[PDB]
């Protein structure tokens, strides 16, 4: 997809993530588990809901064919009537099929964008307090218990709180 | 020793529903919405409780002039729409023509 | 019914239908298409 996340650097989706479209899986001394990102999920639902409504609203006034009859010496106007009615039905068939293919392309890229932005939201909070593994996961250089994990998921991660613990660990590793 | 981890990921399920885009066809997705009605009941019905006038083997001309084969329609109650066959057999029994017939049928379309 | 066509009546809340162009009542909009499906969810890979 355009944003490189879904079936991209994140190899596949999670059957285990049932309560959000995008979210997290963590593992620490306390255990492991899934959690939805409810904010990005809700934003995306709102966008798709509006999209569906927009598409239907804009098609709300389109052409309505009406039966009209003509006698055997009104063939020219009969033919003009047929072409006119068919002409609008072709315009509107095109408008609907095309709009649906275009918006479908945009919806699937919108999801990819949302996953990418969630990953970056975590990446830019953690900075060098964790290692990027390249597969959508981060390995922390400090212990990160459940309240700490929740601070990452809710955008309140406190980098200064853990920066010295992480520095010591980064140095241990880099010193070999 | 391996550290704690957090991973970012996204919903997957067992859906086999597919949609099309401009660059791709038959893309499998978690969820989709059909927006096209393809079914009907094959019958002619009352419209919001009001029965249509169904002329059977009679034409509009046969009804209004009173072709005696059209006696079902000697008096007809209020209708919602009228149904006429493509080529009704009971029309002008004594042959001839009905002047401005299509214009009359147009008027009937608002009565 | 609330929507009648010469082939049969329609009972539906879909925005579109492909039954017949000449309808009366409160109907969906007619198109010639055989399929219109909007994506809502994500790409779902094996």
């Amino acid at each position, epitope marked *: 997809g355009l944003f490189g996340a879904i079936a991209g650097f994140i190899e596949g989706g999670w059957q285990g993530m*049932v*309560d*959000g*479209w995008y979210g997290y899986h963590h593992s620490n001394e306390q255990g492991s588990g899934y959690a*939805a990102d*409810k904010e990005s*999920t*809700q934003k995306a*639902i*709102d966008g*798709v*809901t509006n999209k*569906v*409504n927009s598409i*239907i609203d804009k098609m709300n006034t389109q052409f309505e064919a009406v039966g009209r009859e003509f006698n055997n010496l009104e063939r020219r106007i009969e033919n003009l009537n047929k072409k006119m009615e068919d002409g609008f039905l072709d315009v509107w068939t095109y408008n609907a099929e095309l709009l649906v293919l275009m918006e479908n392309e945009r919806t699937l890229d919108f999801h990819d964008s949302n996953v990418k932005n969630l990953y970056d939201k975590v990446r830019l909070q953690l900075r060098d307090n964790a290692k990027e593994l390249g597969n959508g996961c981060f390995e922390f250089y400090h212990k990160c218990d459940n309240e700490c994990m929740e601070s990452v998921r809710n955008g309140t991660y406190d980098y200064p709180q853990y920066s010295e613990e992480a520095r010591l660990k980064r140095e241990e590793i880099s010193s070999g | 020793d391996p550290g704690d981890q957090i991973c970012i990921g996204y919903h997957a399920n067992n859906s086999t529903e597919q949609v099309d885009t401009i660059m791709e066809k038959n893309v499998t997705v*978690t*969820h989709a*919405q059909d*927006i096209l009605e393809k079914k009907h009941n094959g019958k002619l019905c009352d419209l919001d409780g009001v029965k249509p006038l169904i002329l059977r083997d009679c034409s509009v001309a046969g009804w209004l002039l009173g072709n005696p084969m059209c006696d079902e329609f000697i008096n007809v109650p209020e209708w919602s729409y009228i149904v006429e066959k493509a080529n009704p057999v009971n029309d002008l029994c004594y042959p001839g023509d009905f002047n401005d017939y299509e214009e009359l049928k147009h008027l009937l379309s608002r009565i | 019914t609330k929507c009648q066509t010469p082939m049969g009546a329609i009972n539906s*809340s*879909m*925005p579109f239908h492909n039954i017949h162009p000449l309808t009366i009542g409160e109907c969906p909009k007619y198109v010639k298409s055989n399929r219109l499906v909007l994506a*809502t*969810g994500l790409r779902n890979s094996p």
Partner: antibody
Amino acid sequence: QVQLVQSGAEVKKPGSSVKVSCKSSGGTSNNYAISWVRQAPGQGLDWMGGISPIFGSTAYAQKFQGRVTISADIFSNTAYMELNSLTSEDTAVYFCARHGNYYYYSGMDVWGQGTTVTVSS
Amino acid sequence: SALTQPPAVSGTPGQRVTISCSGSDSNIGRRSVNWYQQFPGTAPKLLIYSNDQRPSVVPDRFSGSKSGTSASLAISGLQSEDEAEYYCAAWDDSLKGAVFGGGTQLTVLG
């Protein structure tokens, strides 16, 4: 300001099925979860399940799994609950209620007026 | 059940009254509590959500709290219009479903 308006009272015989509707008026509820919650006479609230139709989720209480079908029509902004194999144990008022967001954890803040179902031979 | 409440509480106009809610680790323990108020024959109203949060339309005399696997609704300054049934509620991760307490009937004395 959205209101949820439910269908009218139902009188049903044993073994039959009832399908109650919940229309969101004054605005859509398609971007939220709506639950169905029933209250038997003199008893407490009891969750039946819910649906969040754009998100794509339908959930059911284990105790009603298999006997209840919850569904939605996003185009008419309506949610439905169909309960099958009715007995007098199902005589209750059934409410639809909308959650504060797309899923079932959040407080239910908008409620329908309720629909009485009375099951009797 | 799953959540357990006293069937009845009472107070006088202006008194402080509290209503308890006992749960388990699979609900109150690990999930947020919502409270609902219901007058007879009418639908419930959301009073508190996320343990202690109050909708803007709900008077500030209503407050909630959660500790351990227990929760409490407090009504400071009881008013006559508060006579109603009160329900606590939470998601339960073992049942994978929403649960409710059995309800408490509040009587305003006097």
